[PDB]
Structure formats: C-alpha cells, structure tokens
Write a protein that binds this ligand. Structure first.
Ligand SMILES: Cc1cc2c(cc1C)N(C[C@H](O)[C@H](O)[C@H](O)COP(=O)(O)O)c1[nH]c(=O)[nH]c(=O)c1N2
Ligand SMILES: Cc1cc2nc3c(=O)[nH]c(=O)nc-3n(C[C@H](O)[C@H](O)[C@H](O)COP(=O)(O)O)c2cc1C
Lengths: 177, 176
C-alpha cells in the first residue's frame, strides 16, 4: 500500500545521505535488498548492481552471529526497531564490526512493507567510538524523519534515545576485549 | 546571497528536528532573521517576539564574557565554534545552551550569515555526551543540505563535530 512516490522519496533520501542506508522488501520471506546507498557500497566494497536482490546476510560467514541474528529475526517478525552489532566482511574478506540500526518502514504497525537498515562501522573512530556512533544515530534519525518513518515532532526524542542506545552498544562492544 | 539559496535555508529550517537560527551579518546589531520551531519551543518565545533582534537577549547582560569574546572572534573570523552559554527562557527559567556556530556561504572571512544551533544541556541524565553527539550528527546533516558542509566528507565532518560536542559536554560537567 505504498505510493510509487514515497518509494522514490526514500530512494532520493538514500542517494544524498551521509550515512550507509539500506532498504529490504518485507513482502517476501527471502527479504532481498531493494535499495543500497553509496556509503553502504563503499564500506562493503560492492557495486549497487551486484547487491540488489540479495539478502543482506551475504555480508556474513556461516554461523557466526547466532545471538545477534536470533534478535534480528524477532525484530523483523515483530516489526520493531533494533540495534545490534554484527561481525561482517567486505568484498575482500577483511572482517569488520557493523553496528546495525533496523527500522520498520511503511505498511501497517505490526506489518511493515519494508525495513530500513543503517550501518555504522566500528573501530574506525579511535578514542571516540561512542561519540561517532551517537553522531551517526543523529544523522540517521534525520533521514528517518525526512522519509516519515519517525514522526516530525518526535525527531528529537527519537534521536536522544537512538544516540543513547548506540553509545551503550559501543560500550558493550569495547567490553569484549 | 541569493533568492534560491535563502529559500532552501528557510525550507531546511522549517522541516528540521534540531534547534536552528540564522543571523544576518549585514546588519549593525546582527539580528535574528530565521528562528525555527524547535528553537522557539526550547526558549518559549514566538517568531514575532524575537525576529529582528540579536540573540543576546537569551542572556542576562554580563554572565558570558569569556564565551561572547570567543563568539565575537569566531564571527569576525567566519570560523565555526561550539560554546556553552547560560541562557533564559521566556518564562525566565535558566538553562545551559551548547551553541553550535557555522558560517553560511558567502565569503570565507566575511560570510552572508551565521547559522546557530542550540542544544539544551542538563536534560539528558547520564548520556549528555551521547545526546550532544547525536545533535551534532543531525546538525551536520542539515549543514550538508544547506550546502555549507560539502559533499560527503560530511561523515568525517560529522565525526569531528560529534567529538567536539562530547568534549565540551565533559568540560561542562567538570564545572559543577
Ligand atoms: C534493512 C536490513 C538491513 C540489514 C539486514 C536486515 C535488514 C532487514 N541484515 C540482516 C540479515 O538480512 C538477516 O536478517 C540476519 O542475518 C538474520 O536472518 P538469518 O539468521 O540469516 O536467517 C544485515 N546483516 C548483516 O550481516 N549486516 C547488515 O548490515 C545487514 N543489514
Ligand atoms: C547565528 C547566531 C546564533 C546565536 N545564538 C545564541 C543563542 O542561542 N543564545 C545566546 O545566548 N547567544 C546567541 N548568539 C550570540 C549573540 O548573537 C552574540 O553574537 C554574542 O552574545 C556576542 O555578542 P555581544 O558580546 O556583542 O553581546 C548567537 C549568535 C549568532 C551569530
């Protein structure tokens, strides 16, 4: 029940964004990537053409994020937001930790038509991982509000909770050693 | 200046989820020319109640001498600055303002405008740093839209601003 016009608005927001953005079709269980912006493409080292149609787990290897994935599947089925860290791999197979922000888009409250994903690459920010992650959270919420997934009046409150959630996750991630 | 570019700034201002202000550098007293709804909501004034005036009404005379010195230098230089001001709402409630300053377009050392973005400190419990860094992240997005932050070196621009914001917060907490 989503206007071709909204889909295009989302595409335009992805294209101009300063954070990695992905969109996945929820109308089918294989859940293919349907949008993926330039910063996601550079972080991972793929091209847009080779990525679309695939499920985003192609960034993973085997059975590696068992906990994080079980959480992701629930969020998705329950149509809820989620932040989780994931062990991921670029096209060249180097490992990287991906702080993943998930957000339901469109559809109905417990049946979103799409899911948005935004990736924050950990370990690139040195002494200020919390701040960087939180900064990312802020730019994200701005994108969410422009699309309309976050209510405009609630953009601030959303940002504050998402930034906090990101800093916490970083802190637990640097508690892993 | 420009009619197309000023219209864009007005547009970005109206939609935004961050407190935004635009000051006209071409006027003797450097007055508010734009003031967006989350700014008005934070301070409790209306558009008409504050437009055309300089933002120094949020202060009570002499309380931010060092900071306003840093502000005047920045404005003269046309450089960015992040600074904490003691401020007062329309109902005279006091709050500390973490103020973000940015030069808008024009000339590198004499800009057409300054963009101010206010972040209220002390309403974020144990995660002031996170919330400030979040604010900086959102701001940078708006600056990238206006055109001030070029391209998508926005990311590194975001990371630094967020780093700076968090630092300023820590200092402000080392000052009980
Ligand atoms: C919008 C969006 C974006 C992403 C994902 C999901 C969605 C909906 N997923 C998760 C992946 O697609 C898959 O759901 C999880 O691996 C769990 O499902 P499985 O346990 O593999 O069946 C994901 N996976 C990953 O390893 N890195 C990521 O950044 C992406 N981003
Ligand atoms: C764009 C912009 C936004 C500003 N926002 C605030 C503000 O929110 N709160 C405040 O106390 N001062 C703010 N100021 C500062 C005053 O406008 C003024 O520049 C500063 O107080 C130093 O000037 P003065 O020493 O001549 O009073 C802002 C200035 C500019 C240029």
């Amino acid at each position: 029940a989503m206007d071709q016009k909204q889909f295009e608005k989302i595409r335009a927001v992805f294209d101009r964004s300063g954070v990695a953005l992905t969109l996945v079709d929820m109308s089918l269980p294989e859940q293919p990537l349907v949008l993926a912006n330039p910063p996601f493409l550079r972080m991972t080292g793929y091209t847009e053409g080779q990525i679309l149609g695939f499920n985003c787990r192609f960034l993973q290897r085997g059975d590696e994020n068992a906990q994080a994935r079980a959480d992701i599947r629930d969020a998705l089925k329950l149509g809820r937001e989620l932040q989780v860290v994931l062990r991921n791999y670029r096209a060249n197979d180097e490992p990287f930790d991906n702080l993943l922000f998930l957000h339901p888009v469109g559809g109905r409250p417990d049946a979103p038509d799409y899911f948005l994903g935004s990736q924050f690459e950990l370990g690139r920010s040195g002494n200020s991982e919390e701040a960087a992650a939180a900064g990312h959270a802020g730019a994200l919420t701005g994108e969410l509000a422009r699309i309309g997934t976050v209510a405009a009046r609630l953009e601030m409150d959303s940002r504050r909770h998402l930034a906090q959630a990101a800093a916490a996750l970083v802190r637990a991630w640097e508690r892993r050693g």
